[PDB]
């Protein structure tokens, strides 16, 4: 595309390391940089590394960093200690900072947990259009509730008759806290799908609210008795009510 | 070296005039930049200028480098909803010496609200069956000058207003949602703690 990073997302338990990769797929911009993004959404330059084998170290509020330009097309980031979540952006340029400009990659989002048995997947519920809305407006608003997840990394999506829909949809920009103040609080999220009443009224038509929950990895220290809260898709569904 | 974008938030209607202030405090002849960040994505380059009176343009945005008041203000004649994003001012050294770094501003949140031409405020009650102990209330089809307040009740959850566009029919609607894992929850109490239009419609459920 012209920069691919990995991992894309990662859960990290407090005071522990993670290795980051960025590969440059075009030598027209052969300077590479690392930039972090705070949770207050500030962008801070970490490193620019031009030549293979040079390494740079930095300590910031919330993480320690080791940067490494391995090849002409490989940058690496080690990120140690880390009390605060962040996003880490690789960037390439034809020069410096100023001389030509930076082009950001997709980022790695790093979420920090002080514990690990606060992690829960969402319950998902679908709510069918009201009969009063249908008669006032001849439109039909399904609602979907994702409740009781921690931590806050859910992507939500509507599917209509097997196809992903984007039109008619509005998901809350960020989730909200159920136990508001409580540093390990659980989150809820809301979304809306609106079709014409005659679209809903057809019982051929199938509607699924779908939530992708990012949580515990491949393997992790799960000493608990309850089910492992792994990455997973939780769904709820309804049919068109010719009523 | 410093960059200020004085304002944290900016709220605007479709088709409103936009200007975002960028002032720098530097001791070179610095290069200046605009970046935009849409929800979910990383920042995206917009344009660069390095000399007084150099004008940069992309996607209907414009800025002009102004050495006298040390400014690179971002401007657009007519914002639309899809311009909702975070705009970041930055500066660095053109010279190749070096640090290699850009300095970024705090960034400015732009929220473009749509122009609802046929308001029809209503609160409706839906239902489930398949779990929730619950019931949700949908406040919808209000004007953009309505604000939805978070609840006084802690057992109640209320989302902020949010826009959906049905392409196909050029319709945009605001919606907010309210729910509670409990009794005492009717749809005419739901948004008590918001100033809602005098003419908000509260139809009843079922039949006879």
Author numbering:
A (entry chain B): 1 to 243
B (entry chain A): 1 to 208
Give sentences copied directly from the paper behind this entry.
To understand the structural features that contribute to CD8 T cell elite control, we focused on a strongly protective CD8 T cell response directed against a parasite-derived peptide (HF10) presented by an atypical MHC-I molecule, H-2Ld. The potent T cell response to the intracellular protozoan parasite, Toxoplasma gondii in resistant (H2d) mouse strains is dominated by CD8 T cells specific for a single peptide, HF10, (derived from the parasite protein GRA6) presented by Ld. Here we show that the Ld-HF10-specific T cell response displays a focused TCR repertoire dominated by Vβ2. Thus, this example of T cell elite control uses a strategy in which both TCR and MHC contribute substantially to peptide specificity and expands the prevailing view of T cell germline recognition.
The majority of T cells used the TRBV1 segment (which encodes Vβ2) together with TRBJ2-1 and displayed a strong selection for a GRG motif in the TCRβ CDR3. Finally, principal component analysis based on TCR distances showed a predominant cluster of similar TCRs which included the previously identified TG6 TCR. Indeed, the TG6 TCRβ coding sequence from the original Ld-HF10 specific T cell hybridoma was found independently in the two additional mice examined, each time paired with a closely related TCRα. Likewise, the TCRα gene of the TG6 TCR was found independently in one additional mouse, paired with a closely related TCRβ gene. Moreover, TG6 is a Vβ2-containing TCR that provides a good representative of this response. We prepared soluble TG6 TCR by expressing and refolding the extracellular domains as described. We noted a clear difference in the conformation of the TCRβ CDR1 and 2 loops, with kinks in the Vβ2 CDR1 and 2 loops due to proline residues at positions 30 and 52. While CDRs are normally flexible to accommodate the antigens, residues 30P and 52P of Vβ2 likely limit the flexibility of CDR loops due to the confined phi angle of proline and contribute to the re-positioning of the loops toward the peptide and MHC α2 helix.
